[PDB]
Amino acid sequence: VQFKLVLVGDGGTGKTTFVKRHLTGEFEKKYVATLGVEVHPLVFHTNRGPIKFNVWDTAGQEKFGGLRDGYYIQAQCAIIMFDVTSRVTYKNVPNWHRDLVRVCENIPIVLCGNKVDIKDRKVKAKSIVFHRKKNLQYYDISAKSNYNFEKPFLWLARKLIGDPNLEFVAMPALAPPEVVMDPALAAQYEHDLEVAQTTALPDEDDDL
Template sequence: MASGDDMPTFKLVLVGDGGVGKTTFVKRHLTGEFEKKYVATLGVEVHPLVFHTNRGPIRFNVWDTAGQEKFGGLRDGYYIQGNCAIIMFDVTARVTYKNVPNWHRDLVRVCENIPIVMCGNKVDVKDRKVKAKAITFHRKKNLQVRRDFQTH
């Protein structure tokens, strides 16, 4: 946890395959708008997200990482000093869920004991390939998973 002011600030690392919706997820929380057009993230983008809690506001500096393989060599540097992480996959693309263990392995290699949440994205799309009952990786690694929900 770092703080440039009195607001508690955490580095949140957002990882997952390219195209799973990481940047759209962040921008939806920042602006309330939904971007349909896919533009690949190059390297990393950092976005501050402030949440208001009953103990006051907290800031997550979200490190939105590129999911494409060609940026793999840079990732460890983005993970350093991460306080928490989200591993995102696309429920309409089974391979993105199959890659969750790889993302988890890479994260815990750099950030041993950080809290990690697994997030299945695009639950609003009808052509779902990863069914809720098939999502079991989190049980093996004690990760937090929320049942289907949508942000509006």
């Protein structure tokens, strides 16, 4: 039960940061431009069984475009992402949506305004209207705040499975094993542990 998911948008918008946040739970602060495409499997546990997305995280920078619309073929859903702090990223949404629906003429598409955590927001809410005439779903999201980070996938899973009451559900919690530490390297797992102690945790000014 696996679907192909193409993720387009201008560079810097947060495409791969958003996907990484769902794969591992981490937030990546460094911008390392994607090169062509990165494919990742991503699984969610619903009340109608598991659902797997093959997320084709596409590159935004033109100089790293790779196959470009070659990545869109046989897609079954897609996210277009822009940056609510960068007006031009929303200006180009009609261009990404152009190349995406010429290859994929009938798929559920989510439009995402990332970076709503930044307070000096440039792309005002009342001005976001591209999704109306084109039957796209829209969400404000922030991969840093996790605000609405669940919703693009929940909506898409509701449209591909065909169930409007599909919901996310808690995984089964297997009973953890009983393992004693290894005394052969126990004398060395203070090396790996002191490093960790002396490396300050990121974002000590957050609420958690």
